[PDB]
Amino acid sequence: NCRSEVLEVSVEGRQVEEAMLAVLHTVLLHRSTGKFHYAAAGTYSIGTVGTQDVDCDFIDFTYVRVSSEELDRALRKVVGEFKDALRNSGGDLGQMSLEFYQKKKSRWPFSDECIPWEVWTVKVHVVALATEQERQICREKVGEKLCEKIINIVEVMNRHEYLPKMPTQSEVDNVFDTGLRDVQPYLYKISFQITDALGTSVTTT
Amino acid sequence: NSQDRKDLDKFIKFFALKTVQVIVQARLGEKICTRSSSSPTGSDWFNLAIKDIPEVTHEAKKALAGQLPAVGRSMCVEISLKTSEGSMELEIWCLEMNEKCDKEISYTVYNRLSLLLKSLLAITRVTPAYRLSRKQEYVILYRIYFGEVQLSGLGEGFQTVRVGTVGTPVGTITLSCAYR
């Protein structure tokens, strides 16, 4: 019964990237462990995860991410593709989604089914600014908002009970992404989507 | 005792030590950067690279005096600021132990404590005292003690951000922060 969480931020254009990187990394900070080194007997040792602070150029904000420079590009590139799509879409509103799934083996010939257990969606609202003062004020207020966002992500990280059980050695790529050198995230995929802004009903009001 | 609780009290002790480490280091005015490692040392607690500051460790053990958080006895880390005139309690981080016993629970606790430390790494950077401390005029202050959690020194209208909770056969640990 995959759990879903929705966030929303209102930023200037040149603030999208960092904003996105602050959310993703934060989530990926909680959804990753040290790299497993298995022994033939079945036991395994767990590596050590490093963390570092990222100061934002365009936001008055700092966030903690894992010290894996390949993960940082797996994020920066897809965030760059989303940032490309937003500008190409014109004056309309976009969103990115981060899903954590596990692989489940199915009998031949069926492909193994990816079952998601957790999905994080953040909706991006882009505002165009006109003066330099608006830019400065935006730099501070977006920082405060992102503080609230990280706080809520952390509280959700307690309100979520389920996690996949630890795999055995041959079972490990059904649960974890083992392609990185310095961190072992849960199996995840990041996609994005440019929304059509819809209306609000004049019923409850 | 049973060895499982020897390991559990060891886990709680080093979780408290690393908690103080993370908070104090998050108030030192500079950015923290530690490296990952596939061949770790025997001193990488909770699979995290958190370097111990020996002075912070000495004040943390001297405050601890050889005991652990329990029902009624909680570890607190007070971050304050003293102007050139001269004492605002900015935030008090609270490490509690609760009555409820998780009887349906050896290393699940270890991993949950690791995740809680990661949440602490995240939360310590989004409270106002962080960007207050990164621009230091002003000098940041820390003080570790057992509570008897004394809230009043902050002010009226405070709010509590809950870092997280972890369940153990001996009780549930609660890490939170009351900040100005």
Swiss-Prot record, chain A:
Its main location: cytoplasm. InterPro entries: ATG101. This is Autophagy-related protein 101. One of its GO terms (cellular component) is phagophore assembly site. Residues 150-154 are annotated as: Important for interaction with ATG13. It is found in: Cytoplasm; Preautophagosomal structure. Pfam families: ATG101 (PF07855). Belongs to the ATG101 family. GO terms for biological process: autophagosome assembly; negative regulation of cell population proliferation; positive regulation of autophagy. Interacts with ATG13. Associates with a complex composed of ATG13, ULK1 and RB1CC1; the association with this complex requires the presence of ATG13. GO terms for molecular function: identical protein binding; protein kinase binding; protein-containing complex binding. Changing D53R: Impairs interaction with ATG13. Keywords: Autophagy, Cytoplasm. Autophagy factor required for autophagosome formation. Stabilizes ATG13, protecting it from proteasomal degradation. Changing H30S: Impairs interaction with ATG13.
From Swiss-Prot, chain B:
Belongs to the ATG13 family. Metazoan subfamily. The LIR motif (LC3-interacting region) is required for the interaction with the ATG8 family proteins GABARAP, GABARAPL, GABARAPL2, and MAP1LC3A. Part of a complex consisting of ATG13, ULK1 and RB1CC1. Interacts with ATG101. Interacts with ULK1 (via C-terminus); this interaction is increased in the absence of TMEM39A. Interacts with ULK2 (via C-terminus). Interacts (via the LIR motif) with GABARAP, GABARAPL, GABARAPL2. Interacts (via the LIR motif) with MAP1LC3A, MAP1LC3B and MAP1LC3C. Interacts with TAB2 and TAB3. Interacts with C9orf72. Interacts with RB1CC1; this interaction is increased in the absence of TMEM39A. It comes from the Eukaryota. It comes from Homo sapiens. This is Autophagy-related protein 13. Residues 119-126 are annotated as: Important for interaction with ATG101. Phosphorylated by ULK1, ULK2 and mTOR. Phosphorylation status depends on nutrient-rich conditions; dephosphorylated during starvation or following treatment with rapamycin. It is found in: Cytoplasm, Cytosol; Preautophagosomal structure. The chain holds residues 6 to 190 of 517 of the full protein. Autophagy factor required for autophagosome formation and mitophagy. Target of the TOR kinase signaling pathway that regulates autophagy through the control of the phosphorylation status of ATG13 and ULK1, and the regulation of the ATG13-ULK1-RB1CC1 complex. Through its regulation of ULK1 activity, plays a role in the regulation of the kinase activity of mTORC1 and cell proliferation.
